[PDB]
Amino acid sequence: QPPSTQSTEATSGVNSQEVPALTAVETGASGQAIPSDVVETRHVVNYKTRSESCLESFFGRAACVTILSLTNSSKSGEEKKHFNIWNITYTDTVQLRRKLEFFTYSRFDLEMTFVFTENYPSTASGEVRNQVYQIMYIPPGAPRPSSWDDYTWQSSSNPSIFYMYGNAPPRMSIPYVGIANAYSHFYDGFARVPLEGENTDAGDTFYGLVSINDFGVLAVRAVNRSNPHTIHTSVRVYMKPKHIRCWCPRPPRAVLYRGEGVDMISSAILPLAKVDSITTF
Amino acid sequence: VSQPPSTQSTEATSGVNSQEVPALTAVETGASGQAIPSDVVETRHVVNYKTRSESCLESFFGRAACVTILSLTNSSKSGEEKKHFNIWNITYTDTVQLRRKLEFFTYSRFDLEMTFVFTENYPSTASGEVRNQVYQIMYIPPGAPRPSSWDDYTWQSSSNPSIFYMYGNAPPRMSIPYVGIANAYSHFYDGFARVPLEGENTDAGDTFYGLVSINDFGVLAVRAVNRSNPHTIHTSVRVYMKPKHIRCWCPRPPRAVLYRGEGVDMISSAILPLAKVDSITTF
Amino acid sequence: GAQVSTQKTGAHENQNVAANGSTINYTTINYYKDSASNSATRQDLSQDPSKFTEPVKDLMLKTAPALN
Amino acid sequence: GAQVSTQKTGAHENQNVAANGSTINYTTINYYKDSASNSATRQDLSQDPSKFTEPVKDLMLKTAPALN
Amino acid sequence: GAQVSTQKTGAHENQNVAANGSTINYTTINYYKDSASNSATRQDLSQDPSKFTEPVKDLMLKTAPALN
Amino acid sequence: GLPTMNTPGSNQFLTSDDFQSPCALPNFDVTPPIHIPGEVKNMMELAEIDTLIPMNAVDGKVNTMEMYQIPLNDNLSKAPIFCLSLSPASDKRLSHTMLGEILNYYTHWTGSIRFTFLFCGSMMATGKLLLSYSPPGAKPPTNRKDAMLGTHIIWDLGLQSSCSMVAPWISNTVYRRCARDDFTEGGFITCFYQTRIVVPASTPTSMFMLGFVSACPDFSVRLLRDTPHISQSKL
Amino acid sequence: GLPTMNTPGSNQFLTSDDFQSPCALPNFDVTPPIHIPGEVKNMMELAEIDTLIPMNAVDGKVNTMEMYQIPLNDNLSKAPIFCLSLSPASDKRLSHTMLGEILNYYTHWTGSIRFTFLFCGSMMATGKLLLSYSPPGAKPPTNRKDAMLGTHIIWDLGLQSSCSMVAPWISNTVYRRCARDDFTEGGFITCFYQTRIVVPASTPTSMFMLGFVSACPDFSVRLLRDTPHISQSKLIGRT
Amino acid sequence: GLPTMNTPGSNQFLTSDDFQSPCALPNFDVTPPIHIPGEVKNMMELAEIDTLIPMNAVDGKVNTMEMYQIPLNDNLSKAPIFCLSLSPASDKRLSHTMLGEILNYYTHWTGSIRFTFLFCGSMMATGKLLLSYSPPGAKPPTNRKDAMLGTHIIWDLGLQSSCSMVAPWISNTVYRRCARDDFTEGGFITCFYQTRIVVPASTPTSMFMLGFVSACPDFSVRLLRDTPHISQSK
Amino acid sequence: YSDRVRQITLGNSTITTQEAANAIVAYGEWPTYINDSEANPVDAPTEPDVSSNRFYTLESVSWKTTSRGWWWKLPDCLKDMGMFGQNMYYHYLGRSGYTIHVQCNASKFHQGALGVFLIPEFVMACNTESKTSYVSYINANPGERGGEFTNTYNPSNTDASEGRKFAALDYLLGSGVLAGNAFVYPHQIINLRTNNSATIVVPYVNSLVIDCMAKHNNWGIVILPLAPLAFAATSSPQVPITVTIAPMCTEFNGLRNITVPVHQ
């Protein structure tokens, strides 16, 4: 059988030199008292468990992490909008990063699902054939395409997915790919150490984990040639960690995020509500 | 691998001139009469192979029913933005046929299957090309944030469950485990969420009574996924539900009159459900 | 790890269990880790109406005068 | 080469002992070469909160004075 | 007629021994008559660098002077 | 990978479907069960409970408490007190009973039906009643004489006041329809006096009787259908 | 060759889906695991950590460090020093403690909750404090007299600087909702002086106490949900 | 017949797929294999082969044969005579060697790197060179002193015409990016004279050294990626 | 053998007290040397032993009744500390655990409390608003001197000079995270009422087995005046706070020419 939470044993009145209800918070230890130490209790049997809050369950759902914008353009301009290159990150989304940021370190495999949706944004509606999209991963160090029709879309090594609109949302599994044994959610350091002969103005984005995060980019394009009647396609990227362990827990952020790091906005330094009094329930 | 039980078989009988007369049985005791044909008439022996399977509760409650209809609209007109967003509480107030069947019991325990049927039409005189739509359904448990609009951050659904459905594929489906905080769902609640006290208003609790005051399992949110098209398109979403793995307790009669509202309220215009006949001796 | 059991009978059966040999067996496999995902249970034909039709303290006999 | 294991219980299930019926079992087969492609793992419900709630070198008993 | 093999490990998996847990197990069946239709082969980690890095007729030792 | 063929019936939504599906809330542990009394396992357990028959729903006595009260008296009569069509689903009065309500969710039914009558007179009241069931397909019971060509019980009013008659399962068919049609003739149930009710001076002269109907243990139903007694405004 | 029938639910994307999928990066050599201190296996392990309660959320204390300081004084008063609604993921004061933050991701919760109080006055100061909990009925106590008619502990201020009270699981339900709800209201916690704080010469007359809250070992949660505690402007796709 | 559910990812094409498929040419006779010499089973077998380093990157020696010829003189000097940034894939001097090119098909790499040098001067000339590797996060090896502080060997010129210096895998990360990631700095490889080259009368006083780079046996690579060194018109 | 009395003996220095709370071993783990099974570099390691694993004192700070806290980075503080400091500049890589002992003496008539929290990866926000993550090396790494917290936020949106600094807000712990949950991190509290000292054993924590100390601060330390300092005197007496730190099981790898970082 799986473990359940502990049962509470039956108790009665106590008159002893034992002090389970008294402690010393200063030690760094939490209080250890349970109802059986403080009040008379009955025997209960606990069949309730905590699987619902295990880390795999906590992090068990896919979340939207970014939105990409692709356009099929019949105009002389906006050819460039046929493809969209995004830095891979989860920091565009606050709900997911907040959950991940409960831990200093994490190790997990990741799976991605994409959802495509499209409309006809122009007043001049007309026939458009069903379109196909290519999702290409460009690893760090790999070349970027300059255009939707750029030769690098050949993908001889870069992995990619060809999705035809209307089929089941495309999907793929990614193994843990850190160069460390665990992913770092936080990094109190610099990518490079400025040395004595260097300028004293020594910030310039070197500070923070952001400066050491290069997981490549995701390049998505429509794979066709322009059609007279244009399309705006929105691609929502979903992520779900899988097989996840974490270490060195930390409290969540109470205020709105400012960019990639832990920077704060002056408009959100006061996260808690006021009350009328200390004595109001 | 065994023979299922059949309904009661009949033994052969003959008339009995005795002091044992089961026909004359009291009901004043609260018991029902138990006589069967072998007790009152001469009978033929009959082997009984008939099985009460459709009457078991799992079968009675084993079919999906439409529960509600949601209206979702996709349009380029700015005044229609709010119509791409549809919020609905889960309740079976909206569906007479299913509510009534559930009512036969005071309490029930079951897992529930949900299926969504989407249908598209043009609500206006527009009829040009639009692109195939995608719909998102996310469930928002009590206490979770609600989206303010169809296009918002809460749609991230990082912890809330959700389904993305492409129009034209098989209707999406999901199983929901029993979610009560009780050991059974209550079909009825003869009580108040809170007890007013210490001299507060004597009318207190007047609008906070009955099952609705304690019934909150969350809300279902459905939204258009696509950016707007020049030609307005409307989708009717039919939500179907089917209980399964079901146990029930404490029988009740079914409602005999037109329901009105969430609870047991009668409608004054329809409290006369029984048909009249011409005579007690009509046949 | 499949389960095998009999089917509800149809038009060409003699209505006896296993009297139709293997004809009436079917195979079912659960594909999910969460039992909520399972298809409906085997019909449970067990029942006991006395809970509602003869809920009495003093056992009643059919031939005895009910009001002894 | 299937794995067979117990399902989490639901509405019509047993005493949450998973020792009552075989109808609570389910099966699965891994279909991909990398384990990263598999389903989420079986839940490990082992816990040890003491490493965060009472990380003290010199152990105190809860009924002892915290400080003597 | 399925064959089985060890899956490559992942994030929550065991040590590099890959010997811990029967759950690391990818199962496969070929569905075509031509083996050209089969999925890719098992990783072959066998290596022989001497063919290209030390194809010396003489026996050369690393500690011995290369010359003499 | 594995070659497959999609047969007809694929990707359809059937409301009677019994296929497995992913759990939206996977690994939710279910709130533990407790014993709750009154567990119901089969709808038949409720069909077998005696329920009052709304027999006197005539001339303003319809949809009132008096609707279930069958009048009786101390006069001379060779006429029926009451008459019911047997069909538990089509008779207007039997349909609106617990048995009829469970039954109305079904199209076919079979088995014997129990009719129990309780006399609520004075203790000093006496008399004897003739209750009978006449199988279908012949001149209806009409008077008290023809009514005896069939199953009957003579109810001698006494301390064990309540009594019952079972309209035995007699049919040509295996099952009968719940739907009214001309073929599925249920037969008739009527009751008339063997003798008038007799009471002593200065006691009530009129009395009421309460009839009940319930399923016998051999009873069953088959195919489910929507119930015609439920209604709603268009949504 | 093998005939098949697609069921409802086919070709849909469920965020709760646990189906297997192809690897985009086959045969990848995964960096080996190492031992890392502080592994967390369950979120509940963090829920059991005692953290401070921002009780003093009155105007001028709210959102500053003084928010966590419960005032105490040697003046004699029968008034309560504090009051809390026991609704750990709703009460403005509790929803942002670590226990509340974990619970903000859950819909339903259960089990006892522990409250620990640390006195930070001088060594020279003494007195006695009454902590009390009552089930969600009758009236919140506004008087020590009623506070006594419930579950309570009297804490001798002394060398053991801290004490705790546990609000036992008393509920009609198995699980209470996190969402504010009258039906599932959790009860009341209050504190009164039993004995005024006694202050000798040269000792300050005002003191602070730090209150803490944590999950007890029997504590559990049922169901995940999104938190109404973090937000952002609408996200617009790069173009 | 058999009830089934299509999952996300259905009816999509992944270039990384490893699925079975029907044969377009049923029952085809594949010409039998023969023992073809020189079999390669793994790309690392090529990574371990010593190839030349195009060290003489000075304008005018670029894209010519002289590109691989490192000049030496008998002139007394304390100057550095060699400066590599190590990153096998991103260093302009290494990215075009076979090791660097193999790595330009990978995102990450590990293991120690070997540098082998060959003296091609007169038989008559002798002397000693300092070959040194200095870990990153430090002032470049400006002079011989700094080179001596780091990991080094002294190559005493004689009959054994070559020598090997190894730059061990000292890294904070397990793997480094192949990409020019300032975070995973290579460190520095340099060379100083240990002593002036001693040249007897009537010999050349200017000679060349060749350098080679190869993978050590603990070397490996990770994810495959497109190489930036090749292109074409649309 | 009471819990209130301790003797800490590392290297060639001993710290004692007649008043302490039992020491915390974060996560229940002691610092150890890297096992062959988890090693990254192949360089035979430098193991300074007593040369590094001894206590050093950071400059004492004064606790005023208006203080909002102090912070230090652990490896940064020890950067100039004798041989430990030299090995940091001589090697690319290095690893150490720590023993941290914090003291603050007070009279029986003083009240107030200092929480001592250790934050693995203590990452503080940029005080510029403007461009994100703009922090200078020099201000990020103050040495044993440390830096402080304020109760006001004033990002220097118009000037980098005050922007190169951290937005060290006390009530959001410099990161946006509420101070009341600081207790999640290993911590011990010095309550002037009773306990005058705190001891915490700190394991090395990273995603790597070993890293470069010149680039990364594995741990930070925060001392927060959770309860105000007070005394009956209106003089609002300040009391010293002394933080004493020793590295543990120190090892270094990757000997290189000694480096010097950008200086003030």
Ligand SMILES: CCCCCCCCCCCCCC(=O)O
């Ligand atoms: C074919 C697509 C390959 C995508 C590779 C990148 C996978 C996610 C990298 C980890 C995300 C950052 C985590 C962190 O902040 O520590």
Ligand SMILES: CCCCCCCCCCCCCC(=O)O
């Ligand atoms: C992801 C979707 C979650 C849906 C949760 C709601 C499930 C139904 C709640 C129970 C409603 C009352 C049932 C009853 O009357 O017996």
